[PDB]
Amino acid sequence: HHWGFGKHNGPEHWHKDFPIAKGERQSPVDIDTHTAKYDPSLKPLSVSYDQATSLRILNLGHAFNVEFDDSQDKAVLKGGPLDGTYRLIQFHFHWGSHDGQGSEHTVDKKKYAAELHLVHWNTKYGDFGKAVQQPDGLAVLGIFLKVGSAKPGLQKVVDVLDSIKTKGKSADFTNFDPRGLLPESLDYWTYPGSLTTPPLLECVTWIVLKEPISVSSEQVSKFRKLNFNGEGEPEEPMVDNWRPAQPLKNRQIKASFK
Ligand SMILES: [Cl-]
Ligand SMILES: [Zn+2]
């Protein structure tokens, strides 16, 4: 594909191939904590990953995915702002060229070192490819990463990155429990938005956790040793694969908490 994160094919350019890039419900956005409306009618999230079944980890070129077997009918996100049940299909991250940036969502303009996205599709549409064509097709759980103590549950992900350094490489990645990536609290903000990479489809109910996870400097630095390029090509370190905040327009961010 033409799009990427370079000066000439990066987010400022995506609209040429994907005109919805300038649409009405684009992601990510800045979350203004003063104006986000507390809604005490928002239910607790239900995150059930006990039966989530990881399969593989793959370098897609702009980031890496940890892919799950989404036939596992109890591996599910529901509750919160959602109707019905959503199946976990993959997770991935966005990160920066340094610790002071890398997140896609921002909180009062604050950028985190990275952001984790756990992607789920609405079972009422049969599969992921059908779900992305509907406004309520996906639910993405977003979790900020900040630098400090190490996150033990991330270690297996960061240690495997060496073996999938370049575009196209994959590795077995079974027995990975995504519960190890969740913070203590599930308090969240939610708003209707989009995929943050092309095709940028406006099919996503965003659920962004207020509480970041701490990861160590060494852990996040392993993200930056990945490469955009394929094997043999000239080294281009994979960094700054985040889309900046987009106009909120006529949307309301709600908060499940104070
Ligand atoms: Cl490490
Ligand atoms: Zn993402």
Side-chain angles (χ1 to χ4, degrees):
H1 50 57
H2 190 68
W3 68 269
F5 287 95
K7 303 180 289 281
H8 296 104
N9 69 0
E12 339 84 86
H13 295 278
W14 292 352
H15 68 104
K16 286 172 271 167
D17 287 293
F18 307 91
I20 196 67
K22 305 187 154 191
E24 295 296 302
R25 297 195 307 271
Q26 289 293 292
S27 300
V29 294
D30 181 54
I31 296 167
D32 182 331
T33 63
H34 182 69
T35 60
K37 172 127 186 64
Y38 176 40
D39 183 354
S41 292
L42 276 171
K43 290 164 196 175
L45 274 188
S46 175
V47 182
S48 306
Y49 287 165
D50 183 54
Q51 301 301 331
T53 296
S54 59
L55 306 173
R56 300 259 131 198
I57 185 178
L58 167 70
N59 191 329
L60 301 191
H62 66 286
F64 65 87
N65 279 8
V66 174
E67 299 173 320
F68 287 83
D69 170 13
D70 63 9
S71 71
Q72 300 301 317
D73 70 16
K74 305 199 182 59
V76 156
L77 180 67
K78 62 189 271 184
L82 306 174
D83 294 320
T85 58
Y86 290 71
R87 302 255 184 83
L88 177 68
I89 182 165
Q90 52 101 334
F91 69 79
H92 60 275
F93 301 80
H94 304 261
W95 62 90
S97 48
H98 62 93
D99 290 349
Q101 62 195 37
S103 68
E104 293 201 309
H105 293 86
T106 60
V107 177
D108 300 325
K109 295 296 167 55
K110 179 195 173 49
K111 296 174 179 185
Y112 289 90
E115 181 174 336
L116 165 63
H117 289 162
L118 295 119
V119 182
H120 313 72
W121 56 271
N122 196 333
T123 61
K124 95 185 183 186
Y125 297 124
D127 53 63
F128 174 95
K130 290 169 185 65
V132 298
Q133 305 306 329
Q134 308 295 330
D136 63 341
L138 307 180
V140 183
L141 180 58
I143 301 172
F144 297 117
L145 280 60
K146 61 178 198 181
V147 172
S149 294
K151 191 70 172 175
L154 177 55
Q155 202 57 46
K156 287 188 295 317
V157 172
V158 298
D159 285 339
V160 82
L161 295 188
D162 179 82
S163 71
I164 65 161
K165 183 171 304 298
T166 50
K167 166 163 98 216
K169 305 275 288 176
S170 83
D172 187 269
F173 203 73
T174 54
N175 318 121
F176 180 81
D177 195 328
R179 291 173 293 185
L181 299 173
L182 304 175
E184 161 179 338
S185 168
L186 295 180
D187 288 348
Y188 62 90
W189 305 277
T190 181
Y191 75 96
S194 79
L195 294 171
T196 70
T197 49
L200 302 169
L201 296 163
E202 296 177 338
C203 62
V204 176
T205 297
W206 278 97
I207 298 167
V208 173
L209 298 187
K210 172 175 180 184
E211 182 175 3
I213 52 162
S214 287
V215 303
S216 66
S217 178
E218 9 178 30
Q219 285 188 313
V220 72
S221 66
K222 288 186 187 195
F223 286 0
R224 308 189 185 107
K225 290 179 193 108
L226 285 162
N227 289 342
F228 282 130
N229 61 273
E231 210 167 51
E233 304 298 312
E235 192 165 319
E236 304 163 74
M238 181 186 292
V239 294
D240 290 323
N241 59 358
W242 50 279
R243 189 192 195 195
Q246 305 295 309
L248 182 62
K249 299 195 182 264
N250 305 295
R251 299 173 279 178
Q252 166 89 78
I253 306 174
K254 306 187 303 196
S256 75
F257 67 89
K258 210 184 307 190

